[PDB]
Amino acid sequence: SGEIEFKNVWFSYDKKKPVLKDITFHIKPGQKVALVGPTGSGKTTIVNLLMRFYDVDRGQILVDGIDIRKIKRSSLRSSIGIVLQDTILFSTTVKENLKYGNPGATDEEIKEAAKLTHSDHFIKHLPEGYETVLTDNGEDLSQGQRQLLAITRAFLANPKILILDEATSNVDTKTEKSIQAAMWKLMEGKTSIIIAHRLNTIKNADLIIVLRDGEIVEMGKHDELIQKRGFYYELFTSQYGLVVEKEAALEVLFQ
Numbered sequence: 109s110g111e112i113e114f115k116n117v118w119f120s121y122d123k124k125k126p127v128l129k130d131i132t133f134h135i136k137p138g139q140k141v142a143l144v145g146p147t148g149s150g151k152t153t154i155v156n157l158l159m160r161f162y163d164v165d166r167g168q169i170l171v172d173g174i175d176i177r178k179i180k181r182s183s184l185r186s187s188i189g190i191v192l193q194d195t196i197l198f199s200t201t202v203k204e205n206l207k208y209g210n211p212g213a214t215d216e217e218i219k220e221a222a223k224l225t226h227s228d229h230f231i232k233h234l235p236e237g238y239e240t241v242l243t244d245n246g247e248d249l250s251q252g253q254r255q256l257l258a259i260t261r262a263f264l265a266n267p268k269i270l271i272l273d274e275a276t277s278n279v280d281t282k283t284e285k286s287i288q289a290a291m292w293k294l295m296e297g298k299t300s301i302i303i304a305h306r307l308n309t310i311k312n313a314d315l316i317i318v319l320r321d322g323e324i325v326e327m328g329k330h331d332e333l334i335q336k337r338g339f340y341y342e343l344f345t346s347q348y349g350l351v352v353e354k355e356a357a358l359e360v361l362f363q
Contacts, residue, residue, distance in 0.1 A: 109268035110137035110299030116167035142304035145319030189267035195258040197246035203238040209265030225290040227256040252279035270300040305361035
């Protein structure tokens with residue numbers, strides 16, 4: 109479970125000038141894949157097609173050997189889990205938010221998962237704990253904490269495919285290490301597609317897919333790509349020695 113294949117995929121929203129051109133790659137079950145490339149390189153569109161917000165104009169996409177066009181839509185969506193950088197939540201208790209993705213779970217199973225994903229602690233400090241109402245869709249919580257809940261939520265849902273933003277950096281250091289431990293736990297034994305901009309996650313990915321102008325221009329592990337002086341090398345060194353501000357991430361991979 110979690111196998112993903114794009115075979116000669118072409119796509120355009122306009123049906124005028126293509127956005128994606130001959131996208132071809134294969135992901136083995138349980139791999140961690142970094143999609144890297146500047147804004148508008150095709151990252152978003154690849155993920156939009158995998159979630160089947162649109163069908164491809166040419167080629168095909170397979171999830172575990174089956175064309176996604178032939179998969180029941182509710183079964184495709186519930187087998188894919190997304191965590192964004194700026195998560196939106198529902199205006200109920202913390203417990204109820206977590207219980208999306210697994211409504212049938214017991215109250216203890218919720219706490220176990222929240223424990224396994226390092227969000228239990230901050231939840232307990234909320235004025236009413238797991239019963240705390242998250243008014244205005246999580247307004248009171250910090251961006252990191254909302255991301256924490258989404259991770260625990262997705263952990264409960266146990267999808268076979270994860271589509272992930274990197275952890276937010278506009279967080280306290282304690283919460284960041286917390287989020288990263290939580291994401292590692294979430295990714296365990298699952299196929300993970302990461303819209304990557306952190307050096308560390310790009311360096312440790314099982315596979316890097318480098319996109320430029322809607323095409324794959326390099327594909328492989330960091331050690332392979334870094335010894336040729338192509339586009340990846342340019343992205344990786346674009347910040348080298350430059351002072352500011354968030355040294356962990358390549359700024360050109362989201363701006």
